[PDB]
Amino acid sequence: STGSATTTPIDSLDDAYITPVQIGTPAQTLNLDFDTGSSDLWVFSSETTASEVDGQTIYTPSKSTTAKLLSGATWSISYGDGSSSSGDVYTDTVSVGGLTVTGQAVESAKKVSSSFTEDSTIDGLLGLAFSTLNTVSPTQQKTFFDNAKASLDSPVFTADLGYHAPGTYNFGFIDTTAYTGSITYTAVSTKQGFWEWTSTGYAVGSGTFKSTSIDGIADTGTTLLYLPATVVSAYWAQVSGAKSSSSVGGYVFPCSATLPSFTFGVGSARIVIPGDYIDFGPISTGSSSCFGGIQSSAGIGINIFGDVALKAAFVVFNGATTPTLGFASK
Numbered sequence: 001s002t003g004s005a006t007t008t009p010i011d012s013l014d015d016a017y018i019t020p021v022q023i024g025t026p027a028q029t030l031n032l033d034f035d036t037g038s039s040d041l042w043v044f045s046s047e048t049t050a051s052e053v054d055g056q057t058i059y060t061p062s063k064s065t066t067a068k069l070l071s072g073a074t075w076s077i078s079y080g081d082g083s084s085s086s087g088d089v090y091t092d093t094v095s096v097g098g099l100t101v102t103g104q105a106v107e108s109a110k111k112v113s114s115s116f117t118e119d120s121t122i123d124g125l126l127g128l129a130f131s132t133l134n135t136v137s138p139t140q141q142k143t144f145f146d147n148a149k150a151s152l153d154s155p156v157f158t159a160d161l162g163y164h165a166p167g168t169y170n171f172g173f174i175d176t177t178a179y180t181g182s183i184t185y186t187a188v189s190t191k192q193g194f195w196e197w198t199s200t201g202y203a204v205g206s207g208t209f210k211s212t213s214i215d216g217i218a219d220t221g222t223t224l225l226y227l228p229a230t231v232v233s234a235y236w237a238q239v240s241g242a243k244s245s246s247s248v249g250g251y252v253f254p255c256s257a258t259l260p261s262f263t264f265g266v267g268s269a270r271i272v273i274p275g276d277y278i279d280f281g282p283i284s285t286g287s288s289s290c291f292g293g294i295q296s297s298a299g300i301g302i303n304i305f306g307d308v309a310l311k312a313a314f315v316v317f318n319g320a321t322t323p324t325l326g327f328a329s330k
């Protein structure tokens, strides 16, 4: 089997991308944020505290003939930005892009934090990191990908995110029309439950490539590219008037600037992030200070190759017995 779904940016900055997902029978279609940095499939639901729901589409298990309470199971998760959600668990049929899983754990939110309520475009998250991070207790549950794997033609999914445009998530096959050149594969560590890999270095604009190992994760759920402070300072030093602002919470730059590209290494291959991808626009409506798309990972405890980086590439998440990541230009 295979599946193929279009993913669409939630706003004009590509803060996140939402992909339609069918849950239940008859289908209830919710727009979820596919997240390679977490391992829970959770939804706004008929159980979510009514004051915490503002415009999201909800899953109603009582209207699904295939929904079953997973008796006793609870879940609770927090994300890097201080947002969180928790609730109980149903099993139901879940389809993505034509690929169906029966008996998928669908984590129903009873509570969500403010930055979920305030985003009407995200109806939940679909985790695609390793199932060892799933928060369901007392019986940990599998991700949609881990449940689908045995049915797939090839144990892979691919992320092809758009810059200010829709893109595609594919399951079970590699669309050889979707990228240019060859895919370079690189080793993954699953020790922390993430798609963790080591980049071979970086360049800023037309500058020389610096060969240096940068451990990090491939995380579709993160907007920005979070790298060591050395690397980030080297990038922003090339933008006149850029500075790190404690008040704003990262590097800002004059909106009048033209940003340089950023290149990262994948083995002997190179992925070039155009400068335009690093612009996240005014810090506040009408400001002439703009927020940068490359930020320090100091204090996060991990480097994160988020959407700024991944949208520059065709990315293969190879879930074979020995997992690997692949990157191609496109």
Ligand SMILES: CNCc1ccc(O)cc1
Residues within 6 Å of the ligand: 016, 033, 035, 079, 081, 083, 115, 116, 119, 122, 125, 221, 222
């Ligand atoms: C913006 N805070 C809620 C949130 C949204 C999306 C996501 O991947 C994690 C957390």
